[PDB]
Design a binder for this molecule. Structure first.
Ligand SMILES: NC(=O)[C@H]1CCC(=O)N(Cc2cccc(Cl)c2)C1
Ligand SMILES: [Zn+2]
Length: 140
């Protein structure tokens, strides 16, 4: 679990969104495993606007934050799970690191702010859904 709170927005993994999130839906994309809903209170996170390929992510299954190098956001094939059949997931970045399904939502950050959230994993790899291209998250 985990979410990003920027301005009047809440960013979560699409597969973990709540009834309030869908009722207050701003934008969602199944192919990215992302969902954004509106909030009443102002959040305090900053989204990074950069091309960083190094950062730190939180891994709940190890209660640990790990420094990682990660790939550029890309269209990557993702195996079937409890929430999606096998498909291509867009805007996905991989790193060598530990992750388990419940680790989804853990933040990846660089010196500039939040880069994305854990979305995939398996075989010593961890994948993050990028949020740096969602420029509208910085306004209104
Ligand atoms: N983005 C996806 O398709 C997810 C959907 C939910 C989900 O359980 N997975 C599988 C998964 C396996 C290992 C680590 C992680 Cl973080 C996730 C894939
Ligand atoms: Zn950065």
């Amino acid at each position: 679990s985990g979410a990003i709170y920027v301005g009047n927005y809440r960013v979560v993994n699409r597969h973990l969104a709540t009834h309030n999130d869908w009722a207050n839906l701003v934008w969602e994309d199944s192919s990215r495993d992302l969902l954004v809903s509106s909030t009443t209170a102002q959040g305090c996170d900053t989204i990074a606007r950069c091309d960083c390929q190094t950062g730190v992510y939180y891994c709940s299954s190890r209660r640990k934050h790990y420094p990682v190098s990660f790939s550029k956001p890309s269209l990557i094939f993702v195996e079937a799970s409890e929430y999606y059949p096998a498909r291509y997931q867009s805007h996905l970045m991989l790193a060598v690191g530990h992750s388990e399904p419940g680790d989804c939502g853990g933040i990846l950050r660089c010196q500039h702010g939040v880069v994305g959230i854990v979305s995939t994993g398996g075989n010593g790899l961890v994948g993050f859904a990028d949020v740096r291209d969602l420029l509208w998250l910085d306004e209104e």
